[PDB]
Design an enzyme around this catalytic site. Structure first.
Site, PDB file in Angstrom:
ATOM      1  N   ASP A   8      -3.814  12.698  31.895  1.00  0.00           N
ATOM      2  CA  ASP A   8      -2.727  13.296  31.073  1.00  0.00           C
ATOM      3  C   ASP A   8      -1.676  12.197  30.805  1.00  0.00           C
ATOM      4  OD1 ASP A   8      -1.501  15.298  29.527  1.00  0.00           O
ATOM      5  OD2 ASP A   8      -0.753  16.419  31.253  1.00  0.00           O
ATOM      6  N   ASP A  10       2.233  12.947  29.680  1.00  0.00           N
ATOM      7  CA  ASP A  10       3.610  13.310  30.090  1.00  0.00           C
ATOM      8  C   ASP A  10       3.654  13.628  31.587  1.00  0.00           C
ATOM      9  OD1 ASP A  10       4.410  13.231  27.200  1.00  0.00           O
ATOM     10  OD2 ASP A  10       3.596  15.212  26.999  1.00  0.00           O
ATOM     11  N   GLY A  46       2.139  20.694  30.014  1.00  0.00           N
ATOM     12  CA  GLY A  46       0.684  20.718  29.785  1.00  0.00           C
ATOM     13  C   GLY A  46       0.210  21.501  28.559  1.00  0.00           C
ATOM     14  N   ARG A  49       2.357  22.516  21.672  1.00  0.00           N
ATOM     15  CA  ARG A  49       3.675  22.785  21.062  1.00  0.00           C
ATOM     16  C   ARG A  49       3.848  24.270  20.730  1.00  0.00           C
ATOM     17  NH1 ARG A  49       4.540  19.284  15.841  1.00  0.00           N
ATOM     18  NH2 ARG A  49       3.767  17.826  17.474  1.00  0.00           N
ATOM     19  N   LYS A 117       0.476  15.923  20.445  1.00  0.00           N
ATOM     20  CA  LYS A 117       0.144  15.170  19.225  1.00  0.00           C
ATOM     21  C   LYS A 117       0.911  13.839  19.141  1.00  0.00           C
ATOM     22  CE  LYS A 117      -1.474  19.220  16.655  1.00  0.00           C
ATOM     23  NZ  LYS A 117      -1.004  20.357  15.834  1.00  0.00           N
ATOM     24  N   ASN A 118       1.887  13.618  20.035  1.00  0.00           N
ATOM     25  CA  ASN A 118       2.652  12.362  20.114  1.00  0.00           C
ATOM     26  C   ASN A 118       1.989  11.331  21.064  1.00  0.00           C
ATOM     27  OD1 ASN A 118       5.060  12.793  18.329  1.00  0.00           O
ATOM     28  ND2 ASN A 118       5.240  14.642  19.605  1.00  0.00           N
TER      29      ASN A 118
HETATM   30  O1  LIG Z   1       4.951  18.698  20.718  1.00  0.00           O
HETATM   31  P1  LIG Z   1       3.760  17.870  21.202  1.00  0.00           P
HETATM   32  O2  LIG Z   1       4.171  16.472  21.639  1.00  0.00           O
HETATM   33  O3  LIG Z   1       2.612  17.942  20.260  1.00  0.00           O
HETATM   34  O4  LIG Z   1       3.215  18.750  22.465  1.00  0.00           O
HETATM   35  C1  LIG Z   1       3.952  18.853  23.677  1.00  0.00           C
HETATM   36  O5  LIG Z   1       2.933  18.743  24.713  1.00  0.00           O
HETATM   37  C2  LIG Z   1       3.548  18.625  26.005  1.00  0.00           C
HETATM   38  C3  LIG Z   1       2.391  18.275  26.959  1.00  0.00           C
HETATM   39  O6  LIG Z   1       1.455  19.347  27.117  1.00  0.00           O
HETATM   40  C4  LIG Z   1       4.288  19.936  26.335  1.00  0.00           C
HETATM   41  O7  LIG Z   1       4.881  19.857  27.636  1.00  0.00           O
HETATM   42  C5  LIG Z   1       5.342  20.196  25.237  1.00  0.00           C
HETATM   43  O8  LIG Z   1       6.048  21.434  25.491  1.00  0.00           O
HETATM   44  C6  LIG Z   1       4.722  20.178  23.822  1.00  0.00           C
HETATM   45  O9  LIG Z   1       5.751  20.368  22.763  1.00  0.00           O
END
Ligand SMILES: O=P(O)(O)O[C@@H]1O[C@H](CO)[C@@H](O)[C@H](O)[C@H]1O
Ligand code: NA
EC number: 5.4.2.6
Length: 219
Positions: A8, A10, A46, A49, A117-118
Site C-alpha cells: 500500500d 498511504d 484504505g 475516494r 488514484k494519486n
Molecule cells: O482520493 P484518492 O487519492 O483517489 O483516494 C484516497 O485513497 C486513500 C487510500 O485508500 C483513502 O484513505 C482516501 O480517503 C481516498 O480519498
C-alpha cells in the site's frame, strides 16, 4: 521463499494518510458534519475516494444530490492534490528505500496495491517509480478494498500467485483485502487499530528483508 511484496502507499511508503485525514475533516465541517476525528478516520483509510465520501455522508444520515456528491469529491481531491505538491524523497518513511533496494538485489518483485488514484504522481514525487515492477490500476478492478481484487491484480501483474506474496498495510480495510487474497499480511501501526491476530510492527524501520523472511518461515 516469497516471490513478491505488494505495498500500500498511504501510511506505508509516506505519511500521506495524515493529509487525507486533514482534507476530509475540512470538507465534512464545511457541510456541517463534525464527526471526522482521528478515531473515525480509521474507517476512511484504505478505501476509495467515493466510498470515503459516502461513509462521511452516512455519519449524519445526510442526503446530497448526485451533482453535489461529484462536486464534494472533486473539492476534497483538489485540496489534497495542492497539499502534496512539495512531497519529496525526504518524505519517504524510514527503512522503505533500503527495503526496495534489498528486494530488487534478491530478484523479489515489487508492486503497488493502493486504492488511491494519486499513487503514480506520489511515486514520481518521491523518485520511487523505477523500483516498482507494477502499479495495479485501482480503476480496473470490479470491487475496491476491503475486497481482495487489487492485491490479486498486483500479484498477477508481476507474474506471481497471491499465495507466494506478502502485503504491507496501515489500514483496517487493506488488512482484510490481503487476508481474502491469499497473501500474507504484515501491518504497521497500533494493534488497537489493526488487530491482535496478525503480525504488526510499530514503525516502518522494522520492515527489513530479514524480518519479512522470518515471518514467512514461521507463518
Ligand atoms: O482520493 P484518492 O487519492 O483517489 O483516494 C484516497 O485513497 C486513500 C487510500 O485508500 C483513502 O484513505 C482516501 O480517503 C481516498 O480519498
Ligand atoms: Na521525481
Amino acid at each position: 521463499m516469497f516471490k513478491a511484496v505488494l505495498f500500500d502507499l498511504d501510511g506505508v511508503i509516506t505519511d500521506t494518510a495524515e493529509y487525507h485525514f486533514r482534507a476530509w475533516k475540512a470538507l465534512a465541517e464545511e457541510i456541517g458534519i463534525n464527526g471526522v476525528d482521528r478515531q473515525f478516520n480509521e474507517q476512511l483509510k484504505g478505501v476509495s475516494r467515493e466510498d470515503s465520501l459516502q461513509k462521511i455522508l452516512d455519519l449524519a444520515d445526510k442526503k446530497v444530490s448526485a451533482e453535489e456528491f461529484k462536486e464534494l469529491a472533486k473539492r476534497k481531491n483538489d485540496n489534497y492534490v495542492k497539499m502534496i505538491q512539495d512531497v519529496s524523497p525526504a518524505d519517504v518513511y524510514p527503512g522503505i528505500l533500503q527495503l526496495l533496494k534489498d528486494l530488487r538485489s534478491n530478484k523479489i518483485k515489487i508492486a503497488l496495491a493502493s486504492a488511491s488514484k494519486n499513487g503514480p504522481f506520489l511515486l514520481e514525487r518521491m523518485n520511487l517509480t523505477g523500483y516498482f515492477d507494477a502499479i495495479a490500476d485501482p480503476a480496473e478492478v470490479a470491487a475496491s478494498k476491503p475486497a481482495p481484487d487489487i492485491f490479486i491484480a498486483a500479484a498477477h501483474a508481476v507474474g506471481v500467485a497471491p499465495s507466494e506474496s506478502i502485503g504491507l498495510e496501515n489500514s483496517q480495510a487493506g488488512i482484510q483485502a490481503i487476508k481474502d487474497s491469499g497473501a500474507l499480511p504484515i501491518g504497521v501501526g497500533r494493534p488497537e487499530d489493526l488487530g491482535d491476530d496478525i503480525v504488526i510492527v510499530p514503525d516502518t524501520s522494522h520492515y527489513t528483508l530479514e524480518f519479512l523472511k522470518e515471518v514467512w518461515l514461521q507463518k
